[PDB]
Amino acid sequence: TNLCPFGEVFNATRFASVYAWNRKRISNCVADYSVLYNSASFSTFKCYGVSPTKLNDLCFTNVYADSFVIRGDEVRQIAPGQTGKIADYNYKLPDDFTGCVIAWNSNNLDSKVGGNYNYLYRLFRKSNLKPFERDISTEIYQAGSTPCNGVEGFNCYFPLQSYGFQPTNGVGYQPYRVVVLSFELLHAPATVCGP
Amino acid sequence: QLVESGGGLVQAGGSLRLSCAATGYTWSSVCMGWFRQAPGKEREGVAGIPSGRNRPYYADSVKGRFTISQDNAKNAVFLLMNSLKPEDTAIYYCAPCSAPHDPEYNYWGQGTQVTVSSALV
Ligand SMILES: *[C@@H]1O[C@H](CO)[C@@H](O)[C@H](O)[C@H]1NC(C)=O
């Protein structure tokens, strides 16, 4: 009858930049999705390998909640097998993911008149992330032919870039908070069950 | 949106200060840059100013003559150009430094024309 703390995942006082995404581990608790189904704030609620009309009836070995901010047009990339700057360089789901992806518009909290420019994403990287890999390094990226020696220049870029979150952007350029719940089902007693 | 301004017609040897004011995805908190396009050539980087970690950098043809600066509070980038040369004639654009290699950056402004007369050289 330990209720799982979805309140502190979905309504956390701070959300991470997608390049430095946060993971919270959920276990030893009862997960009621009623607050989640009854959101009418969520614009995305997609599950993979499981039905969302079954969740309160299911138990899992472990559950992880990954969370971060991206722009609206990029929510499509938070799904298995996707490509693009977020799926390739920031947050990668395994080809065989089991879990759910929940997202909602956070313009009111994460935008500022004149712009909030402190949510960042990785814009360059030499190779794709591995699934669930997290890369917070900040080494200068060689985009041209001449090596950079750690100096920024016209072809030598800091690898992160800022989103420009201002409330007048169209929704595809507005901030969305994302929570990814991965359900891992192992050959063991369940620690996360519905009611 | 973005407004760049300050361009004009100047004698050789003269000066110009360009101003850029950008908001949203035309601004970057990591690095902002000035670029230029001479007629019939391709865009060229002129100067970039990282918000930290690193000093501003300049095209070889303008080092010692141009100075890039910022005001983070007003979302402004500035290019002070001294000792202007006829071949500095171009449209000057302001954008995030990474914009040339960002396949998603489609927010290039109209720019501001700078023209340097060779009537007196
Ligand atoms: C988070 O807060 C919103 C209101 O801001 C509320 O509607 C929602 O139920 C809360 N979520 C959880 C998981 O408590």
d(CA A144, CA B25): 23
d(CA B48, CA B34): 6
d(CA B38, CA B31): 23
Rg over alpha carbons for chain B, rounded to the nearest Å, is: 14
**Which domains, ranges and CATH numbers included, belong to chain A?**
6-120+164-193 (3.30.70.1840)
Instruction: Pick the closest to residue B4 from B13, B16, B14, B12 (CA basis).
Output: B16
d(CA A160, CA A103): 23
Q: Which contacts (CB < 8 Å, 24+ apart) does range A31-40 have?
A: A31/A4, A31/A6, A31/A55, A31/A56, A31/A63, A31/A192, A31/A193, A31/A194, A32/A3, A32/A4, A32/A56, A32/A194, A32/A195, A33/A194, A35/A6, A36/A6, A36/A10, A36/A102, A39/A104
Nearest CB partner across the interface for B30, out of A153, A161, A173: A161
Q: Provide the strand spans (E) within A34-115.
A: 42-48, 59-60, 62-71, 99-105
d(CA A160, CA B30): 7
* Distance between B121 CA and the closest CA of chain A, angstroms: 30
* Neighbour tally for A193: CB within 10 Å: 14
A45 touches chain B (CB under 8 A): no
Contact A118 B29 (CB under 8 A): yes
d(CA A155, CA A142): 6
Residue reference for tokens 């759910």: A100
Contact A152 B26 (CB under 8 A): no
Task: List CB contacts (< 8 A) between A120 and chain B.
Answer: 29-30
Contact A115 B27 (CB under 8 A): yes
Where residue B65 falls (left for φ over 0; alpha for ψ -120 to 50; beta otherwise) is: alpha
Interface of B with A (CB under 8 A): 23-31, 33, 45, 48, 50, 53-54, 57, 59, 75, 96-98, 100-102, 104
Is residue A33 within 8 Å of residue A58, measured between CB atoms? no
Rounded to 10 degrees, what is the CA torsion of B98, A94, A171, A44? -170
Task: Please enumerate in sequence order all residues whose Cβ is within 8 A of that of A140, keeping only pairs 6 or more positions apart, or say none.
Answer: A148, A150, A151, A152, A156, A157, A158, A159
- Where is B16: in which H helix or E strand? strand B16-22
Nearest CA to ligand 1 atom 4: A11
d(CA A148, CA A136): 20
Atom of ligand 1 nearest to the CA of A38: 9
**Which domains, ranges and CATH numbers included, belong to chain B?**
2-117 (2.60.40.10)
d(CA B17, CA A138): 33
Nearest CA to ligand 1 atom 9: A35
Task: List CB contacts (< 8 A) between A107 and chain B.
Answer: none
| Resolution of the solved structure (Å) | 1.9
Q: Is A74 helix (H, G, I), strand (E, B) or coil?
A: helix
d(CA A104, CA A97): 21
Nearest CA to ligand 1 atom 6: A39
The pairing of beta strand B44-50 with beta strand A62-71:
unpaired
Report in angstroms the alpha-carbon separations of A30 from A34, A39, A179. 12, 19, 18
| Burial class, A87, CB count within 10 angstroms (exposed 0-12 / middle 13-18 / buried 19+) | buried
Task: List CB contacts (< 8 A) between B36 and chain A.
Answer: none
d(CA B85, CA A163): 37
d(CA A100, CA B22): 37
For the record, the structure tokens of A161 come out as 């870039």
d(CA A162, CA A179): 20
| CA–centroid distance, residue A40 to ligand 1 (Å) | 10
Report in angstroms the alpha-carbon separations of B5 from B21, B43, B60, B113. 9, 18, 24, 8
Task: List CB contacts (< 8 A) between A162 and chain B.
Answer: 27-30
What is the DSSP secondary structure assignment for residue B100, as one 8-state letter? G
What residues does ligand 1 touch, defined as CB less than 6 Å away? A 6-7, 10-11, 35
For the record, the structure tokens of A24 come out as 């919270």
